[PDB]
Amino acid sequence: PANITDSLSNRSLIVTTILEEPYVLFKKSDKPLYGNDRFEGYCIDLLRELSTILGFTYEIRLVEDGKYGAQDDVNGQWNGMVRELIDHKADLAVAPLAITYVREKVIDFSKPFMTLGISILYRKIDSADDLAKQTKIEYGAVEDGATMTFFKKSKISTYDKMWAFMSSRRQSVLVKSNEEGIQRVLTSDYAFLMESTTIEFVTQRNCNLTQIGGLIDSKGYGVGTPMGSPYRDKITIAILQLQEEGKLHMMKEKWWRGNGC
Ligand SMILES: *[C@H]1O[C@H](CO[C@@H]2O[C@@H](C)[C@@H](O)[C@@H](O)[C@@H]2O)[C@@H](O)[C@H](O)[C@H]1NC(C)=O
Ligand SMILES: C/C(=C/C=C/[C@@H](C)C(=O)O)[C@H]1CN[C@H](C(=O)O)[C@H]1CC(=O)O
């Protein structure tokens, strides 16, 4: 068969990540806190877990440039965590980094540790097309993110209809981060095209916000890895193993469940 316990026991790895609730946070505390110890969140538990199985040591580092990884339109150069990996500056990228076609062409991904899809976040119409087929209520996504790239690329009529809308209204309707989008829903009359996984989080934390419709597509977040990295195939197996016993479900339950609505 294929055995993995301690399979990369000798290695010490550099993990790049980005701050995003509730995947990666700085711990709230009162003594000065140091190293890996600074951080917490779903991705942080996932790391601990993957490290226990695969037996490596690791250092967490926030992406220096502070972006996920888009390709520059003008000169076709990669930027965020995606960049960090190519220049081999990091071994692993553990974050809500969507496994994208474009991204997969320059980097290797593990199999998903979470599956999701694009959805609508509105103030408490119920279709992606209920939206595209109209003009009253404005809608948008995070600029140059996986969500946007979906519509930009889509040959399905509905989503290419919607992409035309947002493209024409680029600077008024595309936001620069999740929080900006959330706030823009609460403040204006705006439907935010957001990843279901993150909607589900804010939904049970703010009682005025709801999800409209189901999943427009389906993504996964994968552990990121330089092109052809040896470690990858192992990380995939180590993932499914956690998924198997239902640790992932429990980690999910831990950070997401809470207050209510
Ligand atoms: C495989 O995993 C375990 C391996 O433990 C030790 O460390 C690894 C890196 C190898 O070098 C190996 O020689 C050592 O024994 C085993 O303890 C375990 O029985 C194996 N699991 C299965 C079910 O195949
Ligand atoms: C929260 C988020 C922000 C992305 C911001 C872009 C502008 C970037 O900094 O590269 C990511 C996380 N998952 C999606 C992705 O992998 O691209 C994206 C969220 C989204 O597009 O809805």
Find out whether 73 and 143 touch, Cβ atoms under 8 Å. Answer: no
Report which ligand 1 atom has the smallest distance to the Cα of 1.
24
4 Cα–ligand 1 center, Å: 7
- CA distances 74 to 71, 77, 78, Å, are 9, 8, 11
**What residues flank ligand 2, with Cβ below 6 Å?**
20, 67-70, 80, 96-98, 141-147, 178, 194-195
Say how many Å lie between the CA of residue 245 and the centre of ligand 2: 29
Is the minimum distance from the CB of 7 to ligand 1 under 6 angstroms? yes
CB 248 within 8 A of CB 196: no
CA nearest ligand 2 atom 14, residue = 146
Q: Provide φ and ψ at 23, rounded to 5°.
A: -80, -50
Q: 80 phi and psi, to 5 degrees?
A: -85, -130
Residue nearest to atom 22 of ligand 1 (CA): 3
CA of 241 to the centre of ligand 1 (A): 16
In sequence order, what DSSP letters do the residues of 139-207 get, joined into one string?
A: EE-BTTSHHHHHHHH--SHHHHHHHHHHHHTHHHH-BSSHHHHHHHHHHSSEEEEEEHHHHHHHHTT-T
For the CA atoms of 135, 164, 71, 16, what is the dihedral angle to 10 degrees?
A: 30
| Distance from residue 10's CA to the centre of ligand 1 (Å) | 14
Closest CA to 106 of 60, 70, 75: 70
- Enter the resolution in angstroms: 3.1
Residue 219 structure tokens: 């993504």
Whole-angstrom CA distances from 222 to 43, 98, 162, 170 are 11, 7, 27, 29
Taken in order of first residue, the domains within the chain and their CATH numbers are 1-116+219-261 (3.40.190.10), 117-218 (3.40.190.10)
Q: Quote the CA–CA distance of 250 and 253 in Å, as a whole number.
A: 5
- Residue 73 CA from chain centroid, whole number: 22
- The overall longest dimension of the chain from CA atoms, in Å, is 59
Which ligand neighbours the alpha carbon of 53 most closely?
A: 1
Cβ neighbours for 3, distance < 8 A, ≥ 6 positions apart: none
Q: Which residues contact 23 (CB under 8 A, 6 or more apart)?
A: 41, 42, 43, 95, 96
CA distance 260 to 20: 21
DSSP letter string over 75-108? T--B-SHHHHHHTTS-SEE-SS-B--HHHHHHEE
Integer-rounded Cα radius of gyration of the chain: 19
Q: Which ligand 1 atom minimizes the distance to the CA of 55?
A: 9
- Those residues with Cβ within 8 angstroms of residue 80's Cβ, 6 or more apart along the chain or in another chain: 18, 63, 65, 66, 67, 68, 69, 70
